[PDB]
Amino acid sequence: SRRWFHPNITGVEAENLLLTRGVDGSFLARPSKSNPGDFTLSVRRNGAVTHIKIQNTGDYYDLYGGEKFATLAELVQYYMEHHGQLKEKNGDVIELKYPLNCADPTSERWFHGHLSGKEAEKLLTEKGKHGSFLVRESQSHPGDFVLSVRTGDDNDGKSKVTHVMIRCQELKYDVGGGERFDSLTDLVEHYKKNPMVETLGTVLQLKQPLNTTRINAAEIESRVRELSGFWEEFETLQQQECKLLYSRKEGQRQENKNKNRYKNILPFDHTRVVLHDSDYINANIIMPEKKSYIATQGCLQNTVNDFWRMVFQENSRVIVMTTKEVERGKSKCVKYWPDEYALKEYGVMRVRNVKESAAHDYTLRELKLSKVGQGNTERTVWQYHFRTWPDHGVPSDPGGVLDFLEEVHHKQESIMDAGPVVVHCSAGIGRTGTFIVIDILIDIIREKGVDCDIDVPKTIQMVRSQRSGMVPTEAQYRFIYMAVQHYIETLQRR
C-alpha cells in the first residue's frame, strides 16, 4: 500500500531511519535525487543500510542487479514473494521483509497542505458530495490540522460541512480524545472503517477525497503556470499504484514466458487481448472509461505471427509504432512489416507494403493484410512509425507528436470499420501510454471544444488500471500537460 515510499528523504536520512527504527529486513524506497526520475531502494542488512538503484528512463523500472518492472508497487510486491530473487553481485540474497512506513501525508489525495477554511468550504460546497473530504493545516494553530467532511444529498440545507480538529502533539495525531495515531494516514484510514459519529446521530463517512486536479480545458495555461505542483501532482498519482495490483496469471504461465519481452511486465488478465485465431499476446485493450487502443510490447521474433493474428482479429487498421527497432544499444522491436512493395507471410497472415511515405517526423507505411487461403480478407492497415523520439526522456516541443496524432486520428476516423488503434514501444507502457493518454485528452477537447473539463491524473489512473504503469515518468507527465496546452492555442488560431 506504498507506505514504504518516502518521497522527500535524502539517502543519508534513510540510513538513520533504517538504523534507529529499522531491523534487518526493513526497507524503504525513495526518489533518487542524484538522478531525477530515478529511484533508490534502501535495505537494512547486517546492521548496515545498502542502497540499490532503480532506473526509469521512460520505458520501465530497471532494478540495478534485479529485473525490470511496470510500477514500483509491482516491484516490491514481487520480491516479497520471491525471496532469493534479490541477489547481490557477490551472490548473497537481500531480503525485503519489513516496510519502513512513511508519515508524510503530502502525496495523499485528501491532503491539501495550506488552504484556508472558507476556501475549503467553497470547494467542498461547490465540488463536493456526500462523504467528500479533505485535511488542511490549521489555520488557528500552527502544527495542527483540520479535516472537513461534506454530508447530505445531491442550497437545500439538507447538506452540510463539518470540520474536525486534528492536534499534533509530539509526533502523533488525534481528534481531541481517544487513540493517537502515528500518521495522518493511519488517522484517516481508521475513521473510514470507523466513522466519527456526532452526538445527534450524524455519521461522517470519509467516502472520497475532493477533486483537485480537474480543470477547464480553456484555462490550462494558468494551471500549468502554477505547476511550474507538477512533481507534487505526479507523486500524488504515483501513490495510488498500490490500488492497481490486479492479477496477471496468464502472463506468468510457463508457456507464455517467452512471449514476454520483459518477463515481469505483463497484461492484466481482465483486459488482456485473448486470441481465438495459443491465445496469449502481451497486449491490453485500453478503453476510455468510442475509440479504443491496444497497448502492447514491440514484436519479439517468436511473436510476430501473433501480432498479425491480433491486428487481424481486432479489425485494427491503424498502428502507431513509437520506437526504433534498436535503441541505445538494445533490441526494442523486431521489424514485423515487409520492405516497400514486398509481400511477406507471417503464418496464416500475409502483408504487402504498398507504399512508404516519409514525413519529417515519421514514416507512414500502407500495408494490405489478409489471410492465406481467403483472398477477400484483405484490409489496408496504415502503420505510422514515429521516428523522432529521444533515447533519453521526452521531446522538446509537443507540436511534432501532435501533428502526428492528428494525421493518425483522421486515418482512424476515415475508416468506418476500424477496430482499436495499436500503439507500441519497448515494453509498451511508457511512450505507449504517453501517446494514448495524450490522444484521449485531445479527443475529449475535440468533441467538446475548449470550454470542457479535463483531468490528467484522473485519466492516467484510469488507463493504468487497464495496463500496468502507463506513463511512468514525471517528464512524460509534464509533457502530457505541455502537449494539451499546445493543442489549445493552435485551436485558437482560427
Short mmCIF file of C-alpha atoms in Angstrom, two decimals:
data_model
loop_
_atom_site.label_atom_id
_atom_site.label_comp_id
_atom_site.label_asym_id
_atom_site.label_seq_id
_atom_site.Cartn_x
_atom_site.Cartn_y
_atom_site.Cartn_z
CA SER A 1 0.00 0.00 0.00
CA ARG A 2 3.01 2.25 -0.80
CA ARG A 3 3.60 3.40 2.81
CA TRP A 4 7.18 2.17 2.15
CA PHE A 5 7.72 5.12 -0.18
CA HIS A 6 9.49 8.15 1.30
CA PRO A 7 9.35 10.97 -1.30
CA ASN A 8 11.27 13.77 0.48
CA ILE A 9 14.09 11.86 2.08
CA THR A 10 17.73 12.20 1.18
CA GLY A 11 19.77 9.00 1.09
CA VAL A 12 21.57 9.87 4.30
CA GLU A 13 18.44 10.15 6.46
CA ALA A 14 17.21 6.87 5.01
CA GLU A 15 20.32 5.43 6.64
CA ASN A 16 19.33 6.81 10.03
CA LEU A 17 15.70 5.68 9.74
CA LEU A 18 16.62 2.10 8.92
CA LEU A 19 19.17 2.15 11.77
CA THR A 20 17.19 3.79 14.57
CA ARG A 21 13.72 2.50 13.63
CA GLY A 22 14.53 -0.45 11.40
CA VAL A 23 15.67 -4.03 11.75
CA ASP A 24 17.25 -6.48 9.37
CA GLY A 25 14.76 -6.88 6.53
CA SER A 26 13.45 -3.36 6.92
CA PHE A 27 13.31 -1.35 3.69
CA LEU A 28 12.06 1.80 2.06
CA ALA A 29 12.02 3.30 -1.42
CA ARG A 30 12.83 6.88 -2.20
CA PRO A 31 13.30 9.10 -5.25
CA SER A 32 16.91 9.30 -6.40
CA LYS A 33 17.78 12.98 -6.04
CA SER A 34 21.02 12.36 -7.89
CA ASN A 35 19.05 11.13 -10.91
CA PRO A 36 15.70 12.89 -11.16
CA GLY A 37 13.19 10.34 -12.43
CA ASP A 38 15.26 7.54 -10.84
CA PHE A 39 14.71 5.79 -7.52
CA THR A 40 16.84 4.07 -4.89
CA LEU A 41 15.97 1.04 -2.82
CA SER A 42 17.30 1.06 0.76
CA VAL A 43 17.53 -2.24 2.62
CA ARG A 44 18.92 -2.81 6.10
CA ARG A 45 21.10 -5.90 6.23
CA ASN A 46 23.54 -7.00 8.94
CA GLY A 47 23.20 -3.71 10.87
CA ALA A 48 24.00 -1.98 7.59
CA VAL A 49 21.97 0.03 5.10
CA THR A 50 22.64 -0.75 1.46
CA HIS A 51 21.17 1.33 -1.36
CA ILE A 52 20.06 -0.44 -4.50
CA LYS A 53 19.30 1.67 -7.56
CA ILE A 54 16.25 1.71 -9.85
CA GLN A 55 16.44 3.45 -13.19
CA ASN A 56 13.41 4.80 -15.02
CA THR A 57 14.14 6.30 -18.41
CA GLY A 58 10.61 6.18 -19.74
CA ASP A 59 10.32 2.53 -20.77
CA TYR A 60 10.18 0.75 -17.42
CA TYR A 61 11.65 0.44 -13.91
CA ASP A 62 15.08 -1.21 -14.07
CA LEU A 63 16.27 -2.71 -10.76
CA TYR A 64 20.06 -2.43 -10.88
CA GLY A 65 21.05 -6.04 -10.40
CA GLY A 66 17.39 -7.02 -10.27
CA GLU A 67 14.89 -7.26 -13.13
CA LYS A 68 12.62 -4.79 -14.97
CA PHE A 69 9.19 -3.67 -13.76
CA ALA A 70 5.98 -1.76 -14.57
CA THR A 71 5.43 0.13 -11.31
CA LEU A 72 7.39 0.37 -8.06
CA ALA A 73 4.46 -1.24 -6.24
CA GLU A 74 4.68 -4.30 -8.55
CA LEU A 75 8.45 -4.43 -7.99
CA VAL A 76 8.04 -4.62 -4.22
CA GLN A 77 5.07 -6.99 -4.37
CA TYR A 78 7.31 -9.17 -6.47
CA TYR A 79 10.33 -9.55 -4.23
CA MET A 80 8.31 -10.02 -1.04
CA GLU A 81 7.02 -13.27 -2.59
CA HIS A 82 10.23 -14.05 -4.46
CA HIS A 83 12.85 -14.45 -1.76
CA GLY A 84 16.32 -15.36 -3.06
CA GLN A 85 15.43 -13.38 -6.18
CA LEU A 86 17.05 -10.20 -4.96
CA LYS A 87 20.61 -11.41 -5.08
CA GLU A 88 23.56 -9.11 -4.94
CA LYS A 89 26.58 -9.13 -7.25
CA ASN A 90 28.55 -11.39 -4.93
CA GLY A 91 25.72 -13.92 -4.71
CA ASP A 92 24.20 -13.42 -1.26
CA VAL A 93 20.50 -12.55 -1.08
CA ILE A 94 18.81 -9.37 0.10
CA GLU A 95 15.54 -9.96 1.97
CA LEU A 96 12.74 -7.37 1.78
CA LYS A 97 10.86 -8.09 4.97
CA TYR A 98 9.52 -5.05 6.79
CA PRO A 99 8.25 -1.90 5.01
CA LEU A 100 9.56 1.13 6.90
CA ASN A 101 6.37 3.23 6.63
CA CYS A 102 6.47 6.96 5.85
CA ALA A 103 4.49 9.61 7.76
CA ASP A 104 4.49 12.36 5.10
CA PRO A 105 0.77 12.81 4.13
CA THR A 106 1.51 15.18 1.18
CA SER A 107 1.13 12.57 -1.57
CA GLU A 108 -2.36 11.67 -0.28
CA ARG A 109 -5.34 12.67 -2.41
CA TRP A 110 -7.32 14.07 0.54
CA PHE A 111 -4.37 16.05 1.88
CA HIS A 112 -4.33 19.66 0.76
CA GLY A 113 -1.48 21.25 2.71
CA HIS A 114 -2.04 25.00 3.11
CA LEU A 115 -5.55 26.16 2.19
CA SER A 116 -7.87 28.32 4.31
CA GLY A 117 -11.13 27.21 5.93
CA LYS A 118 -13.57 29.27 3.89
CA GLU A 119 -11.59 28.31 0.79
CA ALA A 120 -12.03 24.64 1.64
CA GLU A 121 -15.64 25.46 2.36
CA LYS A 122 -16.10 26.91 -1.12
CA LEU A 123 -14.53 23.79 -2.62
CA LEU A 124 -16.38 21.23 -0.52
CA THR A 125 -19.53 23.25 -1.25
CA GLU A 126 -19.02 23.61 -4.98
CA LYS A 127 -17.26 20.32 -5.91
CA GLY A 128 -18.22 18.08 -3.00
CA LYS A 129 -20.88 15.44 -2.46
CA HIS A 130 -21.81 13.19 0.43
CA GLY A 131 -18.73 11.62 2.03
CA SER A 132 -16.38 14.08 0.33
CA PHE A 133 -13.47 15.23 2.49
CA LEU A 134 -10.06 16.80 2.97
CA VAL A 135 -7.35 17.57 5.50
CA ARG A 136 -5.74 21.03 5.79
CA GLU A 137 -3.25 22.70 8.10
CA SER A 138 -4.65 24.83 10.86
CA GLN A 139 -5.08 27.99 10.43
CA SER A 140 -5.79 28.92 14.08
CA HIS A 141 -2.97 26.71 15.43
CA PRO A 142 0.31 26.08 13.55
CA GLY A 143 1.38 22.43 13.62
CA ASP A 144 -2.23 21.31 13.96
CA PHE A 145 -4.68 20.18 11.29
CA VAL A 146 -8.31 20.23 10.20
CA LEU A 147 -10.37 17.58 8.45
CA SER A 148 -13.53 18.69 6.66
CA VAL A 149 -16.39 16.41 5.58
CA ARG A 150 -19.47 17.06 3.44
CA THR A 151 -22.68 15.18 4.27
CA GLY A 152 -26.16 15.22 2.68
CA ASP A 153 -27.73 14.60 -0.75
CA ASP A 154 -27.08 15.64 -4.37
CA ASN A 155 -28.88 25.39 -1.14
CA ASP A 156 -31.30 22.81 0.32
CA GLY A 157 -29.95 22.84 3.86
CA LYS A 158 -30.09 19.04 3.51
CA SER A 159 -26.29 19.04 3.05
CA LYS A 160 -23.61 20.29 5.44
CA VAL A 161 -19.86 20.55 6.04
CA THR A 162 -18.36 19.50 9.37
CA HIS A 163 -14.78 20.40 10.48
CA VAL A 164 -12.93 18.20 12.96
CA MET A 165 -9.71 19.33 14.60
CA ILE A 166 -6.58 17.22 14.44
CA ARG A 167 -3.98 18.02 17.06
CA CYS A 168 -0.34 17.13 16.52
CA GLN A 169 1.22 16.78 19.92
CA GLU A 170 4.69 15.28 19.91
CA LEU A 171 4.73 13.38 16.59
CA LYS A 172 1.23 11.94 16.97
CA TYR A 173 -2.26 12.80 15.77
CA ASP A 174 -5.69 12.76 17.40
CA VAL A 175 -9.20 14.15 17.15
CA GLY A 176 -9.03 15.57 20.68
CA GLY A 177 -9.55 12.33 22.60
CA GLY A 178 -9.09 8.58 22.36
CA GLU A 179 -6.49 6.94 20.16
CA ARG A 180 -3.38 8.77 18.96
CA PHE A 181 -2.11 7.85 15.50
CA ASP A 182 1.48 7.92 14.22
CA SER A 183 0.40 9.48 10.96
CA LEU A 184 -2.41 11.44 9.41
CA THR A 185 -2.83 8.44 7.13
CA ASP A 186 -3.47 5.95 9.91
CA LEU A 187 -5.76 8.50 11.49
CA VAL A 188 -7.73 8.85 8.25
CA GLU A 189 -7.76 5.15 7.24
CA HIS A 190 -9.13 4.45 10.67
CA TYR A 191 -12.08 6.85 10.54
CA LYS A 192 -13.05 5.35 7.21
CA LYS A 193 -13.60 1.95 8.81
CA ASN A 194 -14.92 3.55 11.97
CA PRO A 195 -16.59 6.89 11.12
CA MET A 196 -16.70 9.59 13.78
CA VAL A 197 -20.34 9.79 14.85
CA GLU A 198 -21.77 13.02 16.24
CA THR A 199 -23.86 13.27 19.39
CA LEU A 200 -27.13 13.80 17.49
CA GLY A 201 -26.79 10.90 15.08
CA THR A 202 -24.76 12.37 12.23
CA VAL A 203 -22.21 9.98 10.62
CA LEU A 204 -19.12 11.37 8.88
CA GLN A 205 -18.11 8.90 6.18
CA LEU A 206 -14.75 9.56 4.65
CA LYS A 207 -16.08 8.40 1.29
CA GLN A 208 -13.85 10.15 -1.27
CA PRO A 209 -11.25 12.91 -1.39
CA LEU A 210 -12.04 16.14 -3.17
CA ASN A 211 -11.02 16.50 -6.82
CA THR A 212 -8.12 18.96 -7.01
CA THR A 213 -6.92 18.11 -10.47
CA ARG A 214 -9.80 18.51 -12.91
CA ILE A 215 -9.63 21.75 -14.86
CA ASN A 216 -11.42 23.56 -17.60
CA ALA A 217 -9.57 22.94 -20.83
CA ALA A 218 -9.57 26.65 -21.65
CA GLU A 219 -7.64 27.84 -18.60
CA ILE A 220 -4.94 25.22 -18.97
CA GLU A 221 -2.29 27.93 -19.43
CA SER A 222 -2.86 29.25 -15.93
CA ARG A 223 -2.89 25.80 -14.28
CA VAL A 224 0.39 24.91 -15.95
CA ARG A 225 1.96 28.18 -14.73
CA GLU A 226 1.13 27.10 -11.20
CA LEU A 227 2.68 23.64 -11.53
CA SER A 228 5.92 25.31 -12.62
CA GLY A 229 2.85 21.46 -8.18
CA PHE A 230 3.94 19.21 -11.06
CA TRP A 231 6.20 16.81 -9.13
CA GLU A 232 3.57 17.04 -6.41
CA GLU A 233 0.57 16.17 -8.57
CA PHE A 234 2.58 13.34 -10.06
CA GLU A 235 3.86 11.98 -6.77
CA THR A 236 0.28 12.01 -5.55
CA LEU A 237 -0.74 9.94 -8.60
CA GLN A 238 2.18 7.55 -8.08
CA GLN A 239 0.88 6.87 -4.60
CA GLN A 240 -2.22 5.07 -5.87
CA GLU A 241 -0.42 2.44 -7.96
CA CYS A 242 -0.96 0.16 -4.93
CA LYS A 243 -4.69 0.02 -5.75
CA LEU A 244 -3.79 -1.41 -9.18
CA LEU A 245 -2.06 -4.72 -8.37
CA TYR A 246 -4.52 -6.80 -10.37
CA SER A 247 -3.67 -10.38 -11.34
CA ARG A 248 -1.63 -11.23 -14.41
CA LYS A 249 -1.78 -15.03 -14.18
CA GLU A 250 -1.87 -15.74 -17.92
CA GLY A 251 1.28 -13.67 -18.38
CA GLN A 252 3.14 -15.88 -15.89
CA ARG A 253 2.33 -19.33 -17.24
CA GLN A 254 5.42 -21.25 -18.35
CA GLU A 255 4.19 -21.47 -21.96
CA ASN A 256 3.85 -17.68 -22.26
CA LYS A 257 7.08 -16.56 -20.55
CA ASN A 258 8.98 -16.41 -23.86
CA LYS A 259 6.21 -14.32 -25.44
CA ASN A 260 7.05 -11.53 -22.99
CA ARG A 261 9.89 -9.17 -23.92
CA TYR A 262 10.33 -8.38 -20.26
CA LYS A 263 9.37 -11.34 -18.07
CA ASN A 264 7.80 -9.22 -15.33
CA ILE A 265 5.84 -6.71 -17.36
CA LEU A 266 2.52 -8.42 -18.04
CA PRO A 267 -1.05 -7.76 -19.24
CA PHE A 268 -3.81 -7.74 -16.68
CA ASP A 269 -5.92 -10.86 -17.15
CA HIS A 270 -9.20 -8.95 -17.17
CA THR A 271 -8.12 -6.66 -20.06
CA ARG A 272 -5.60 -8.83 -21.91
CA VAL A 273 -6.22 -9.33 -25.63
CA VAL A 274 -7.30 -13.00 -25.91
CA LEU A 275 -6.76 -14.69 -29.28
CA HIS A 276 -9.22 -17.17 -30.81
CA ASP A 277 -7.27 -17.37 -34.10
CA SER A 278 -2.38 -20.33 -28.14
CA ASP A 279 -4.26 -17.27 -27.05
CA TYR A 280 -1.53 -15.22 -25.48
CA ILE A 281 -0.28 -11.81 -26.51
CA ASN A 282 1.34 -9.20 -24.28
CA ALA A 283 -1.32 -6.67 -25.10
CA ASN A 284 -4.17 -4.90 -23.31
CA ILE A 285 -7.30 -3.21 -24.50
CA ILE A 286 -7.30 0.39 -23.41
CA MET A 287 -10.87 1.64 -23.31
CA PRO A 288 -11.66 5.25 -22.26
CA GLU A 289 -14.00 4.75 -19.28
CA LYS A 290 -16.00 5.03 -28.94
CA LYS A 291 -12.33 4.88 -29.91
CA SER A 292 -10.06 2.36 -28.25
CA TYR A 293 -6.42 1.35 -28.16
CA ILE A 294 -4.38 -1.76 -27.81
CA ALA A 295 -1.21 -1.18 -25.83
CA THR A 296 1.49 -3.74 -26.49
CA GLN A 297 5.20 -4.56 -26.45
CA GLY A 298 7.20 -4.34 -29.63
CA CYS A 299 7.40 -7.60 -31.53
CA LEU A 300 9.67 -10.37 -30.44
CA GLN A 301 10.75 -12.71 -33.28
CA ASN A 302 8.62 -15.54 -31.86
CA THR A 303 5.53 -13.32 -31.56
CA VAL A 304 5.34 -11.54 -34.90
CA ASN A 305 2.82 -14.12 -36.09
CA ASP A 306 0.59 -13.49 -33.10
CA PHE A 307 0.89 -9.77 -33.52
CA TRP A 308 -0.61 -10.07 -37.01
CA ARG A 309 -3.16 -12.60 -35.76
CA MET A 310 -4.25 -9.93 -33.25
CA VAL A 311 -4.35 -6.99 -35.68
CA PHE A 312 -6.50 -9.09 -37.94
CA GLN A 313 -8.76 -10.39 -35.16
CA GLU A 314 -9.34 -6.94 -33.71
CA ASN A 315 -10.03 -5.40 -37.12
CA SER A 316 -7.47 -2.68 -36.41
CA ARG A 317 -6.46 -0.52 -39.35
CA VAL A 318 -4.02 1.93 -37.80
CA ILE A 319 -0.82 1.07 -35.97
CA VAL A 320 1.30 3.50 -34.02
CA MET A 321 4.96 2.50 -33.71
CA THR A 322 6.87 4.65 -31.26
CA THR A 323 10.33 3.12 -31.20
CA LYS A 324 13.37 2.46 -33.37
CA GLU A 325 13.98 -1.28 -33.91
CA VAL A 326 17.24 -0.92 -31.97
CA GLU A 327 17.82 1.92 -29.50
CA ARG A 328 20.64 2.86 -27.07
CA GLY A 329 22.30 -0.48 -27.90
CA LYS A 330 19.43 -2.89 -27.34
CA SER A 331 16.58 -4.51 -29.33
CA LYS A 332 13.28 -2.64 -28.89
CA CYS A 333 11.04 -4.15 -31.54
CA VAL A 334 11.81 -6.53 -34.39
CA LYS A 335 10.75 -5.43 -37.91
CA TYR A 336 7.40 -7.12 -38.40
CA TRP A 337 6.48 -5.39 -41.67
CA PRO A 338 7.71 -6.11 -45.26
CA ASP A 339 10.11 -3.84 -47.18
CA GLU A 340 8.41 -1.45 -49.62
CA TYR A 341 6.46 -3.09 -52.50
CA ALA A 342 7.18 -6.50 -50.91
CA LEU A 343 4.68 -9.16 -49.76
CA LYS A 344 5.53 -11.32 -46.73
CA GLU A 345 3.79 -14.17 -44.95
CA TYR A 346 3.69 -14.31 -41.16
CA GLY A 347 1.96 -17.61 -40.50
CA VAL A 348 -1.59 -17.53 -41.90
CA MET A 349 -1.29 -13.76 -42.04
CA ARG A 350 0.05 -12.00 -45.11
CA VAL A 351 1.31 -8.44 -45.55
CA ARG A 352 2.11 -6.24 -48.52
CA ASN A 353 3.94 -2.99 -48.01
CA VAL A 354 2.20 -0.94 -50.70
CA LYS A 355 3.88 2.44 -50.06
CA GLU A 356 6.14 4.26 -47.61
CA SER A 357 5.64 7.98 -47.24
CA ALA A 358 8.45 9.57 -45.28
CA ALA A 359 7.47 12.66 -43.37
CA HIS A 360 9.89 14.81 -41.41
CA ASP A 361 8.81 13.33 -38.07
CA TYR A 362 7.52 9.92 -39.03
CA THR A 363 7.25 7.38 -41.85
CA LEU A 364 3.81 6.08 -42.85
CA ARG A 365 3.51 2.55 -44.41
CA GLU A 366 0.40 1.46 -46.30
CA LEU A 367 0.03 -2.32 -45.71
CA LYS A 368 -2.57 -4.70 -47.16
CA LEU A 369 -3.27 -7.54 -44.73
CA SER A 370 -5.09 -10.81 -45.35
CA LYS A 371 -5.44 -14.46 -44.51
CA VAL A 372 -3.69 -17.10 -46.58
CA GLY A 373 -6.46 -19.05 -48.33
CA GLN A 374 -9.26 -16.46 -48.50
CA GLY A 375 -8.32 -13.54 -50.76
CA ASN A 376 -11.26 -11.37 -49.65
CA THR A 377 -9.95 -10.75 -46.13
CA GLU A 378 -7.69 -8.00 -47.49
CA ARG A 379 -7.72 -4.82 -45.38
CA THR A 380 -5.44 -1.80 -45.62
CA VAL A 381 -3.54 -1.27 -42.40
CA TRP A 382 -1.84 2.08 -42.00
CA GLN A 383 1.39 1.97 -39.99
CA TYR A 384 2.59 5.27 -38.58
CA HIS A 385 6.19 4.62 -37.48
CA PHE A 386 7.29 7.64 -35.36
CA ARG A 387 10.99 8.31 -35.78
CA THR A 388 12.00 11.39 -33.76
CA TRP A 389 11.75 10.46 -30.06
CA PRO A 390 14.92 10.90 -27.91
CA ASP A 391 16.50 7.76 -26.45
CA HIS A 392 16.61 9.70 -23.17
CA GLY A 393 13.47 11.38 -21.82
CA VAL A 394 10.93 13.44 -23.76
CA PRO A 395 10.90 15.70 -26.84
CA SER A 396 11.34 19.47 -26.60
CA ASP A 397 8.22 20.67 -28.44
CA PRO A 398 4.92 18.74 -28.37
CA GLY A 399 4.00 20.03 -31.82
CA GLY A 400 5.63 17.11 -33.61
CA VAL A 401 3.75 14.46 -31.63
CA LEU A 402 0.57 16.48 -32.06
CA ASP A 403 0.77 16.79 -35.83
CA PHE A 404 1.48 13.07 -35.93
CA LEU A 405 -1.60 12.19 -33.87
CA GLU A 406 -3.98 14.37 -35.88
CA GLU A 407 -2.94 12.51 -39.02
CA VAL A 408 -3.42 9.23 -37.18
CA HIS A 409 -6.72 10.38 -35.76
CA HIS A 410 -8.06 11.27 -39.20
CA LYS A 411 -7.00 7.98 -40.70
CA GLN A 412 -8.76 6.01 -37.96
CA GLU A 413 -11.77 8.22 -38.34
CA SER A 414 -11.99 7.87 -42.12
CA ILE A 415 -12.08 4.07 -41.92
CA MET A 416 -15.60 3.23 -40.75
CA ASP A 417 -14.95 -0.38 -39.58
CA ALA A 418 -11.66 0.37 -37.81
CA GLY A 419 -11.15 -1.52 -34.52
CA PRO A 420 -8.78 -0.39 -31.70
CA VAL A 421 -5.63 1.55 -32.59
CA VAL A 422 -2.44 -0.38 -31.88
CA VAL A 423 0.32 1.52 -30.07
CA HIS A 424 3.68 0.06 -29.07
CA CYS A 425 7.16 0.91 -27.87
CA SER A 426 9.64 -1.32 -25.99
CA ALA A 427 7.66 -2.64 -23.04
CA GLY A 428 4.52 -0.88 -24.27
CA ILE A 429 3.82 1.18 -21.16
CA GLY A 430 5.92 4.33 -21.37
CA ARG A 431 5.85 6.08 -24.71
CA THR A 432 2.82 3.91 -25.48
CA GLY A 433 0.82 5.19 -22.51
CA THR A 434 2.07 8.70 -23.13
CA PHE A 435 0.61 8.87 -26.67
CA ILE A 436 -2.60 7.08 -25.71
CA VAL A 437 -3.33 9.49 -22.88
CA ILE A 438 -2.49 12.49 -24.99
CA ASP A 439 -4.70 11.11 -27.73
CA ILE A 440 -7.55 10.51 -25.33
CA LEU A 441 -7.42 14.02 -23.93
CA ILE A 442 -7.26 15.77 -27.29
CA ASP A 443 -10.17 13.65 -28.33
CA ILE A 444 -12.27 14.97 -25.46
CA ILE A 445 -11.45 18.59 -26.30
CA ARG A 446 -12.07 17.78 -29.98
CA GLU A 447 -15.60 16.63 -29.28
CA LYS A 448 -16.42 19.29 -26.64
CA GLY A 449 -14.24 22.26 -27.60
CA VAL A 450 -12.09 24.40 -25.29
CA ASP A 451 -14.67 25.06 -22.51
CA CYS A 452 -14.73 21.41 -21.40
CA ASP A 453 -13.48 19.52 -18.34
CA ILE A 454 -10.22 17.56 -18.46
CA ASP A 455 -8.37 15.81 -15.62
CA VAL A 456 -4.91 14.45 -16.49
CA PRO A 457 -4.20 12.39 -13.36
CA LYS A 458 -7.73 11.01 -13.29
CA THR A 459 -7.16 9.99 -16.93
CA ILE A 460 -3.77 8.37 -16.29
CA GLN A 461 -5.00 6.39 -13.31
CA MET A 462 -7.94 5.36 -15.49
CA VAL A 463 -5.53 3.93 -18.08
CA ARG A 464 -3.15 2.48 -15.53
CA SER A 465 -5.95 0.24 -14.31
CA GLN A 466 -6.04 -1.32 -17.79
CA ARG A 467 -2.33 -1.87 -18.33
CA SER A 468 0.43 -1.70 -15.68
CA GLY A 469 2.23 1.56 -15.03
CA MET A 470 1.23 3.55 -18.12
CA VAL A 471 3.18 6.87 -18.17
CA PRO A 472 5.84 6.10 -15.53
CA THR A 473 7.88 9.34 -15.55
CA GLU A 474 7.33 12.92 -14.27
CA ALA A 475 8.82 14.04 -17.56
CA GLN A 476 6.16 12.17 -19.52
CA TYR A 477 3.65 13.67 -17.10
CA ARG A 478 4.86 17.26 -17.68
CA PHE A 479 4.95 16.55 -21.39
CA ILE A 480 1.34 15.40 -21.46
CA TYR A 481 0.37 18.77 -19.96
CA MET A 482 2.62 20.65 -22.43
CA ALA A 483 1.05 18.90 -25.39
CA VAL A 484 -2.57 19.57 -24.39
CA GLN A 485 -1.66 23.18 -23.67
CA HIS A 486 -0.10 23.37 -27.09
CA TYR A 487 -3.17 21.82 -28.71
CA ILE A 488 -5.34 24.64 -27.38
CA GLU A 489 -3.52 27.70 -28.71
CA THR A 490 -3.41 26.15 -32.15
CA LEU A 491 -7.19 25.72 -31.94
CA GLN A 492 -7.38 29.43 -31.23
CA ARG A 493 -5.54 30.04 -34.49
CA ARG A 494 -8.98 30.05 -36.16
#
